[model samples]
Every structure is written in C-alpha cells, then in structure tokens.
Target: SGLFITNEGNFQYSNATLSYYDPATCEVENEVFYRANGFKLGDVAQSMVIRDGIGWIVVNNSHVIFAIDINTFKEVGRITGFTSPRYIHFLSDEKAYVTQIWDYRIFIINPKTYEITGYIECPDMDMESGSTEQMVQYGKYVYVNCWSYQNRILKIDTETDKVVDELTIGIQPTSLVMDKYNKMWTITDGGYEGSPYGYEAPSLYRIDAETFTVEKQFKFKLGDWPSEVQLNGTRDTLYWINNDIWRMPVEADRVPVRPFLEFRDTKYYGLTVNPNNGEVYVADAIDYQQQGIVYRYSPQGKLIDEFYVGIIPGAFCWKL
Candidate 1:
C-alpha cells in the first residue's frame, strides 16, 4: 500500500495533477494521470479518494470525477456534468454519492456504470454559498458538514438516500473525523469578519454518532482558525492545523495550547495521520501559485522525510 496525492494546479487555469508515492521504494511518479492516460487531470484537483480498487479524483473547477485503476493509475471511468464537485463517499458499487460546493444537489452515481443515476437535494443549502463539504459515515447514516457561510451538519440516511436529520453547530464546519468510540468531532473556521453571514468565535464539537446531538462544544478564540481535524492510527488522539500543527488526546478537557509542529513561511493546506503508523503528513502550499511540498514526520513530530509534489498539493489518500 502506497500513497496518492492530488495537486490542485494554479487557481486561474486547469492544471490539476496527480502523483503516486511508494514509501518502500522512496519513489514518486508525478503527473500520473497524464503519464498513464496521455491527458491532464482536470482543473483544481479537489480531493483524492481510494475505494475498493479505484481511485476517484474530483476536479472541482472542471466538474469531473476520474476513476483510476489503483493498480495502474490509469483512467478506468469518469463522471462529469457537475456544477463544481468537492468529494465522493461511496455507499456501494452502484450507489456512490458525490458532494458539491456550487450546487445544492448531491449526485448519486453508479460506479460500475460511471453514470449519474440519482441526486440528493439539500434545500437548506440555499443560504448564500451554503455548500456541502466532507462526509463521515456511521451505520446507515452518513453525516456531511455544510461549510462556507453555513453552520450545520446534515445526517443522510444511506438506506433511503435522504437527509433525515440536521444539526446547527459552529460556523463553517470544515474538518470532520470519527474517533474509535464512534464520536463525531469537528472544527469550525467561525467565518471571517465583514461578511454578510457575520462572524463568531470558532468552536470544536463532539457529537454522538447515532443520536446526532452534541455532547460537548468547545469554543476557541475569535482569531484562531483550526482545520483538517484527523485521528491517529488508533483513533484515540486528535491532530489539526491552526497556523501550526496541533495535537490532543480524544478525552481531553480543553484544546492544547501548544502546537505539535510549527514552521514559518509556509502555508499548511492539508494534514493526515497514517492509520498504520500514526505518521504525521503535512502539505505545504508555500505559495498557491508554485509547486507544493509534502513533509513526513514521526508520530512525535520529527521530520523524517520530504518530497516536492505537484502544484498546490491539497489532499492525501492511502492505498491499503
């Protein structure tokens, strides 16, 4: 099992690229999609998700999802006609849901056929720029957070393909993860000031997985922006970015005051903890216009390895 990274090309043009890293060999093959298929991956590579044997690359600005054969990094299937896709959560071989940031509809597709077979409508997503973001699953319910000028989480009944429950928590709930205990934890950006939606102190939430209710709500200061909350290998510790990488235990009373790793002159765009080794991986999009770098660190935050990935490396997926 290696790693897959999606580099969102520059902002103004369609330059999205993909790269594959093999830790065992210490080798990286960049522009994998184009190298294997003789075509560029679409604009703004939003995210990379590996499921079953296929790697789904969501190119948001280009509104397409490329299903690549994980073994070959070759294009196997593609689904387009999106208004700006974000991420994909597979429910089954024939029932995968794709979220969007520009449209209120969640496209349901048949992965085997590579066709849009259905749609899940989020009417409350009508708030100015109320977009459905990342997703986490528990049982038959899939929870999705609404970000960018919104403050809520929608619980979708996977069995029925409908939004059965919703909760209003902190504003701009961007990063979400599930601990081993099935507790849903999330961090809010709290929205910036001088906006139409208004701003508030960002908050961290721990909600019940089945009941869809918040058990504890911890509020951060007005200026701090925490993001990309992730769990370690055992799912008992939490890690995130707030100018610097921060860490904490799952059962802690308050957010950690000190950061786990801090560096200057770098824009931290992505973070993920390897489930097998608990290694910390961080993406530094130094300047969004230039090529990005991926830093690998030990479980205790010592930099062990580094590599230059594609432009604007934004997402990570492990092949296991």
Candidate 2:
C-alpha cells in the first residue's frame, strides 16, 4: 500500500524524520512519524526493515532505534544504549541483530521487548572501526560486511551467534545482496587515492555463499565509486549506482557498460527495488540540507513518479 522513506537530517541541525508514499492515492505525506507521534525521529536515519506489521528504523547520529506500527506510523517501542546504530535485522521473533559503526560487537536485541540483550564479538577483527553495515541471511548463517576503510565479511552462525568464518573482501565492500542462485554480490568502493589505507580500482565480486570464496570478480574503472547493490524481487537481476544506475543479470560474467538510467547532475543517495512488482525507488538528496526527492520507476526503467520527502532521504522500505 505504501513505502516508508527514512531521511538523514543534516548534521548539527535537526533530527531525521519518516515519510510515507501511497501508490493508491499517488501522494506523499511528509513528517509521517511526527504527524502520528507528535514528535520527530532521531538523527541520521540509516536503514529500516519492516516485518510483521512493525518497522524497526535505525537513527545513526541519535544512536537509537524507534519501532513503529506500519499501519499507524506511531511509536510502539525503541532500543537505545547504542554506540552508533547502523542497521537492524530480525533473525526471529525473539531475537534480532543490530549493527553499530563505532562498536566492534554486533548487538543482539529482542524484537518483542526492543531491548539490547547481548552481542556477538569478532575477537580477530581489527578494533579500529566496526562498520558492520548490512546483514544477508542464508540458512542459519548471516553474512555481514565491515565497510569504511576495511575489507572483510564475517560469516555468523545464527544458532551459536558466533563468527564462524570470514573473508577478505575488496578495499571497501560498501553494500551486499544475494542472487537467486544463492550467490553473494557486493560492490566495493575502493578507497580514495589519498586515503590512509591507499586506493585501488573498485570491483564487484561474485562469491559462493557456502564455500565463502570469490567465484568471479569484475573490476570497475579507477576513480569511479559504486555502491548500493540491490537484488530484484526474484533475485535474478541486480542494480547498483555509480554516477548512474546500472543493471546486470545474475548469469552475466561481465559488467554492463551502458547504464540502465542516465542522470543529469542529480545526487542519487539511496536505491532499492520493490520485491513484489520490481519497481525502482531512488532517493535523491538534493543538497543534503533541503528536502530530497524520491523517484519511483518502472522495472523497465521509466519514471513513474517523483515526490518530496525529507532532507537527505536514504532508506527505502516497501510496505505492503
């Protein structure tokens, strides 16, 4: 029926807020959380995952997560005591995983109570930056990427909540997704040339989920930045953004030279594909300080609609 778009409020100014877009009415209602709860959300809205009628939204700079009812957009509960919350993944009704960029341990939370119960620590990982970004689950194992200036992906066991194995990814594995064949794909943002870790050409790696090995690696041009790798509904197609939105199939060995959507001086901050209809939803953060735009495109790459949300809109979660 709608989509939940989380906005990243500007630093040193305001807090993040939630917006709603209804396809049936073709209208976008801004400040949706405040309209229902009478108060705004936290700062630096990172990501959100809605399941079982509730949406758990991570507010990074505010270091808190606000849980709200999807139907009402009202606060139900919240989880605090975070170093710097990035994303939240529900493993089960009783247990969930929350990642933090400043903390080394991935916090274990109770979705029912919305409390931080415990965490899984990687003793062998570098203590500099946790940067645990996204979690993709397969079977009983969940794979998470450590972004920032690091290059590693930790394979965590759900039954034991331990880091069973890990692999050295490219320079900075910015985002991750899984294909229909049970293969993992990630676009690495090889750090900038002057970075302390040194820079390299960005590359996309096709990894075997079970073997934890790189099956194929496609290199991107030097000095180009790519991120936000998203798998389609059927998990047979892939989409990502560099300066433009690009598409590739799960069976393709080489990257596509032509982009699926060409842009004109627009800042494409966040991108996602609808799991049900294969529609494309992109958030364009106009100037990081003003209201941003959310564009809805058909699966065939045609613009469907564009509406204003909040400043620096990032997270896009489809609500059925």
Every model's TM-score: 0.95, 0.96
TM-score of 1: 0.95
lDDT of 1 by residue, 1-320 (tens): 69898999886588889988887776888988899999998789988888888899999998799999998888988999987888899888788888888677788899889899988988577534858889999999899998877788999999889998899987899877888889888999878878688688888889889788898888888977778888987989988777788888989878887788885768888888889988888988898878888988998878878898998888899998
> What does the lDDT read for residue 225 in candidate 2?
81
Clashing pairs in 1: none
Q: Write the per-residue lDDT of candidate 2 for residues 30-137, one digit (tens) a residue.
A: 999989999878779889988899988898888788988999988999988888888888889989998878678899999898788898997555547567888899
List residue ranges in candidate 2 displaced over 4 A. Answer: none
Instruction: Mark the 10 consecutive residues where model 1 has the least summed lDDT.
Output: 123-132
Separate clash counts for every candidate: 0, 0
RMSD of each: 1.5, 1.4
C-alpha lDDT of residue 161 in model 1? 91
Model 2, TM vs. native: 0.96
Clash count in backbone of candidate 2: 0
lDDT of 2 at 181: 89
Whole-model Cα lDDT of every candidate shown, in order: 0.86, 0.86
